[PDB]
Write a protein that binds this DNA or RNA. Sequence first.
RNA 1: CGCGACCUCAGAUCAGACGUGGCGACCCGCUGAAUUUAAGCAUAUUAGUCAGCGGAGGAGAAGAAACUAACCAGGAUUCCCUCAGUAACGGCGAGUGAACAGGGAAGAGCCCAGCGCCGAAUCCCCGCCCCGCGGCGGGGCGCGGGACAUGUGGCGUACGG
RNA 2: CAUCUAAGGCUAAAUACCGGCACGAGACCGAUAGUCAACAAGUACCGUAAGGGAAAGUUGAAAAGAACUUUGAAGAGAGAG
RNA 3: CGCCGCAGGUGCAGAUCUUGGUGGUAGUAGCAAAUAUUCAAACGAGAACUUUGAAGGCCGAAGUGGAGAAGGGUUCCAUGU
RNA 4: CGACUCUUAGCGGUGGAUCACUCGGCUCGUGCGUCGAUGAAGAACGCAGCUAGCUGCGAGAAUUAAUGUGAAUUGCAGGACACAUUGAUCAUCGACACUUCGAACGCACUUGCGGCCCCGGGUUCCUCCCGGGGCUACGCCUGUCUGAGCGUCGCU
Lengths: 50, 105, 134, 60, 86, 135, 122, 52
Amino acid sequence: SSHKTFRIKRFLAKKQKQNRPIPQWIRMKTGNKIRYNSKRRHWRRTKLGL
Amino acid sequence: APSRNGMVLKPHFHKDWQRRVATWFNQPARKIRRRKARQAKARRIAPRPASGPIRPIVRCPTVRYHTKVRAGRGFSLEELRVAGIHKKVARTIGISVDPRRRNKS
Amino acid sequence: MKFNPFVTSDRSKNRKRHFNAPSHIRRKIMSSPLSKELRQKYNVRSMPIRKDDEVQVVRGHYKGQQIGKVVQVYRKKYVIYIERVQREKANGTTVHVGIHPSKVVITRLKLDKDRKKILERKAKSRQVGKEKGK
Amino acid sequence: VFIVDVKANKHQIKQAVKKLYDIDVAKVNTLIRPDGEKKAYVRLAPDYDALDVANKIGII
Amino acid sequence: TKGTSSFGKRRNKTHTLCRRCGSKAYHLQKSTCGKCGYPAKRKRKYNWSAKAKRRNTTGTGRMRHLKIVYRRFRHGFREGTTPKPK
Amino acid sequence: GRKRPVPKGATYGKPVHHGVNQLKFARSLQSVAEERAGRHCGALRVLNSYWVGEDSTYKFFEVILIDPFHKAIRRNPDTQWITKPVHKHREMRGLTSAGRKSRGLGKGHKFHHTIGGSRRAAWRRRNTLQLHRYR
Amino acid sequence: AKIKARDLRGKKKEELLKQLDDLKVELSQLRVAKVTGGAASKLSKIRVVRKSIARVLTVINQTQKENLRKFYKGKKYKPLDLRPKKTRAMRRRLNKHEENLKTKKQQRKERLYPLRKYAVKA
Amino acid sequence: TWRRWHRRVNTTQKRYAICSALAASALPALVMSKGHRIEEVPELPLVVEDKV
RNA sequence: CGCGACCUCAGAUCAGACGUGGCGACCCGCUGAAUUUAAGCAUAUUAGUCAGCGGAGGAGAAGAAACUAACCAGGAUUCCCUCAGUAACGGCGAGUGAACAGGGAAGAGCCCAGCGCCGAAUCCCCGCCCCGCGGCGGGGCGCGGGACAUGUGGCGUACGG
RNA sequence: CAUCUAAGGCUAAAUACCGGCACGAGACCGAUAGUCAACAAGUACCGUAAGGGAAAGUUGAAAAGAACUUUGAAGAGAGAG
RNA sequence: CGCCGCAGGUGCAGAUCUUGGUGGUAGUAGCAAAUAUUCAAACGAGAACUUUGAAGGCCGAAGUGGAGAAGGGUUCCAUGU
RNA sequence: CGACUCUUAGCGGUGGAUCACUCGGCUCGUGCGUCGAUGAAGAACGCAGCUAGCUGCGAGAAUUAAUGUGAAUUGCAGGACACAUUGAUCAUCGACACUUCGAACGCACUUGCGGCCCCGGGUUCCUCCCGGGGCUACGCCUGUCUGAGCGUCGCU
Ligand SMILES: [Mg+2]
Ligand SMILES: [Mg+2]
Ligand SMILES: [Mg+2]
Ligand SMILES: [Mg+2]
Ligand SMILES: [Mg+2]
Ligand SMILES: [Mg+2]
Ligand SMILES: [Mg+2]
Ligand SMILES: [Mg+2]
Ligand SMILES: [Mg+2]
Ligand SMILES: [Mg+2]
Ligand SMILES: [Mg+2]
Ligand SMILES: [Mg+2]
Ligand SMILES: [Mg+2]
Ligand SMILES: [Mg+2]
Ligand SMILES: [Mg+2]
Ligand SMILES: [Mg+2]
Ligand SMILES: [Mg+2]
Ligand SMILES: [Mg+2]
Ligand SMILES: [Mg+2]
Ligand SMILES: [Mg+2]
Ligand SMILES: [Mg+2]
Ligand SMILES: [Mg+2]
Ligand SMILES: [Mg+2]
Ligand SMILES: [Mg+2]
Ligand SMILES: [Mg+2]
Ligand SMILES: [Mg+2]
Ligand SMILES: [Mg+2]
Ligand SMILES: [Mg+2]
Ligand SMILES: [Mg+2]
Ligand SMILES: [Mg+2]
Ligand SMILES: [Mg+2]
Ligand SMILES: [Mg+2]
Ligand SMILES: [Mg+2]
Ligand SMILES: [Mg+2]
Ligand SMILES: [Zn+2]
């Protein structure tokens, strides 16, 4: 909703920042073992906890 | 169901004994710890006897064992009195004292 | 064999410690034997590797008496890079070949304040050991 | 336009801007961006000039 | 209708985020967390749920103070002293 | 006595456990009073208590409490033991004179339930199957 | 070019604070450079300036704390943060004096009947 | 874990086994059967002085 | 009909401390089932067990006899072997079920109240000065306050004093 | 006749330990096994919630990870290395 | 790995068995609720579905219009693939 | 003649069994056996030049200091660093510091609102505003001060 609390907004801010792809140069690190971002969240696919 | 001859047995395993089972795998480690503590205490008290204070000569109580003699808890107050030892000095010089034992013979 | 009850011989534990070793002991792990002349000049046998000392590779594809100066001690990969021990890649340019320091012998030591002190301690300990043995 | 700390109110923003850049400000409007940072728009005094103040700051 | 049609009415959150324990179990209408029981002083904890006990036991988080206490135990909780200066 | 707290007096089970009234709490009222005094004044240590009066519905006990952190207690031996950490909230664990009576602790043929320290200690020791290494 | 806590300690609080303020100004301009494109050198100097600020602050705080400890040396009451922080359980213990002192009856017992060192002939 | 890993053997049987093993080591057929390369050993119950 | 003493109470963001909550494998105090077995089932059994609550420590509890015995007597507690699947309990059915003595591990004993005697000898706190800081200690001084004769400390506890 | 002296209190050692810290070992298991978890696992995800809860190891000694030419818009090929 | 002994979580076609993979069915069912599209052009490698314009139609103000609450949480807006 | 189908082989796909490997477990044993109002466990939010997770850390924020070691870290950049007019890195960690909830502590929170006492600025010290700092929870002990009682008295 438009009417939201400061704590709810802070939580959504963290989620928005957390939902982004991995940096390109990470793959070049020694012993990376990480393919892509497994924790990617789509708003219409998976609904948030709150 | 019983089958042919055999003892009528009453196993006491109706009471979830699996949660309380004492395994003795630490028995040799316990023996070594006891031995090490023994050696450490004996080392600590260098000239004194390692085993402990002298215990009295005591006859066994019941009719099954009264022919036999073992060691008692400590020397009686009367024994100390007639031996000429103060009851507060006997323990320091290394004599076990059993105040609650009275002599009958 | 080994008698210390506090020192493990487990293969898995040893491999875990080796691959998770901190850098300051990765340096000790990445130690190389000295040349015969250095092992005679100083009464020490091996020496941990350094940025600017000159070695020669004794095993693998790049054996030879050529004296090459180290240019990189890549401790995370447990390798070092040597001047002319290199290999040309497809696009035209060239890179260095990772070489475990145990596969080289140090021929000249990058001396400074610290290396001489380390040599002194090692030689003193060796003298102490041999004089106890005699 | 500045990105200020999320806990600083408008009075603190006005004082901090005035002392940091030795300028005079008219008012401060404050909004928290969706990503969480607080963004403050600071109107300068008419006798002052945002363009050359931004020049001397180095954001131009 | 008990099926899909009734599912269109659910738009009022019953539970919400609890300030303690960070779980979406704080019953709004009852003012009590369903996981920790927040207004109550003691943590809501039960022996019939060992999995849930281990989900939040000590060490499942950060242990910011305990991981320094453990380190200090090996040297005996020394204070007011410093290593010998060079 | 202690009436069993069940709604409408229903204990769903075998008729042996159908009792609601005529049930007796296993700890005496004196130990209950000591427990309540200690629980309220948790900063203090319960020492003992004594009966002072009773009517049909109430019983009155006066309870002795010790401040473990007063200097008159800490600097005086023969009372330094009550200040040890293991001696806190003793009444909740039944270490007082009143709380000890309900445990059945003592010497004699009458006290074969508490050999080992407590009823649960004896029960554990008796019901644990000692599986040696060599059988 | 760097700043070292080793030689930062001989200074007075006033020039220490001035140095900290200069470092803060440098850091703020570095942040401006970061958000306005800047360059790699200016980007990398941010970490160095931040550690410099941390070193100056650490020296300031340590100097103040040891001065406060000196002031409260010998006083009966000290601030809690100046009191030892051993462990809550360990701070409630009885000190050495009151764990060592004994009753007059105990002292008389030990004076009269000490533990003798003895041995037994074979 | 309560599987009775340990077995107790009669002391007389244990000493019997020790006696049998000691006797068996004194037969060149048996020791060579173990493959112990006793070909130029001067005497099978090999005894040396205490200097060793 | 005001002023004092005592008693019993109240307040204080008073001076200085203490408790709370966590872990909970082990331990202590409670509360406490049913599934199950009895070829059904209600006593019984599962079981003083699971679940529930409270309180600790590196161990906890116990512990120096209102004991065991009946002997030519033993002698705090706790733990191991054995007694012993026994004595006993039990729709005397299913099932349940210890203790003493013996051998070991370890071994350590004690303190108050009271009865009395000693000019309250007793204790806390606050100041000043000195020696120490390391878990705040000591020494000295205070016609400094307070606790306390509704009883502090010393001797002294069933082993007599 | 024997035995002890209740209704007050303290006390180490032998004893326990599936939680914690740090270690050693194994006739155990070898990635559908062994802890649910060898891996960004109490993770992803599911339920309003109490709670439920996965799958998922291996290039090569070295990236030396395919330069360059060539068709297609690219995927993707064909040479070459 | 053979031989002598030792110890097993030791032998699979079934368990509407568990986990994983794969077939026939099968290029099959089906992509049929609420009237409807057409012409030219632009970009583009590629146009029945994009965009522009010209037509023809629908919602017909209790709308297929304009705004909000709750809920969603960046879906908003540019640019590129 | 072929198409289709069946069987067998060669090869190529799909699939990830088997075999080998193992910074993982499980079991046993040992030594310690340590949380918290001086603010714990837990949570939330943040901190990297380029960093989303895992890890680390708390506005001094992938860490400060100190001590040991002694030339790196590394995916790229950048940049110190005579390594003795003192030092990269890592480790140890005793000094310093440690945001917001949380027993959680001014009141209350799916919001927010106060009170007292100092300091600084507009004021030009007086009391309004802004900023900073310190207090403001409950129970309980000992003492202190202020007290209440046609409670028991004494003098008047
Ligand atoms: Mg998107
Ligand atoms: Mg038979
Ligand atoms: Mg002995
Ligand atoms: Mg606004
Ligand atoms: Mg006395
Ligand atoms: Mg106060
Ligand atoms: Mg039945
Ligand atoms: Mg049946
Ligand atoms: Mg039935
Ligand atoms: Mg029944
Ligand atoms: Mg339970
Ligand atoms: Mg508690
Ligand atoms: Mg105890
Ligand atoms: Mg006791
Ligand atoms: Mg029973
Ligand atoms: Mg007296
Ligand atoms: Mg007695
Ligand atoms: Mg496999
Ligand atoms: Mg698995
Ligand atoms: Mg395509
Ligand atoms: Mg099988
Ligand atoms: Mg099969
Ligand atoms: Mg099979
Ligand atoms: Mg079959
Ligand atoms: Mg069809
Ligand atoms: Mg169709
Ligand atoms: Mg029309
Ligand atoms: Mg129409
Ligand atoms: Mg609309
Ligand atoms: Mg859009
Ligand atoms: Mg194939
Ligand atoms: Mg440093
Ligand atoms: Mg509101
Ligand atoms: Mg009156
Ligand atoms: Zn909660």
